[PDB]
């Protein structure tokens, strides 16, 4: 998605988290904007030494490397839950014998 997400000079609209207190569980979503305390002195919302903002903006330029250029990724999660099947394929059904 370099063509759409890249503009002259680079796009910074998309962020990613750099630090977190612990390992994320599968399908776990944190969106808090708290200051990250990498040190011993609590930040209490105060940045500085060992108090960084966990997010960092991507640099997506048209001249960036292919490994640095933006990519759009979709993750489809499949489940067979306690219910009749709801999402089915284009298969054509037949009469019963």
């Amino acid at each position, epitope marked *: 998605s370099n063509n759409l997400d890249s*503009k002259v000079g680079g796009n910074y*609209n998309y962020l990613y988290r750099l630090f977190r207190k612990s390992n994320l569980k599968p399908f776990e979503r944190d969106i808090s904007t708290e200051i990250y305390q990498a040190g011993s002195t609590p*930040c209490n919302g105060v940045e500085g030494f060992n108090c960084y903002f966990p997010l960092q903006s991507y640099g997506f330029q048209p001249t960036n490397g292919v490994g640095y250029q933006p990519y759009r990724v979709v993750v489809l999660s499949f489940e067979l839950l306690h219910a009749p099947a709801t999402v089915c394929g284009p298969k054509k059904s037949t009469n019963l014998v």
Partner: nanobody
Amino acid sequence: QVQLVESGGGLMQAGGSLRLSCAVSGRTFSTAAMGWFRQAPGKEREFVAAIRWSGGSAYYADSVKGRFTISRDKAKNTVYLQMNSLKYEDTAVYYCAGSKITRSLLSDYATWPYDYWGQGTQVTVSS
């Protein structure tokens, strides 16, 4: 929805120390950038200091380089301007502003418009 509440400054001697604040409420400036301006009588509003919010890189005008310093806090949602080594010419009405556009060059934030402006606070430097 978005309010930029300024504080600090005032009248003091030359070379004094001040640190202007501009509290940001209802919005974050992560991908865009924030900037400071001042407006002296009979003059146009002039650029002083602009900073990228996420990255922390600073950009200063030649009238303020080495004398004024810009800093920000993200959780408190406040930007500061450390006003050291004052001069007589620095007397003006200072305007905090935040942009809605993500500009690739932090230098483009010195001229490109800001869609949020503060109320304005006077700063006077005396003999």
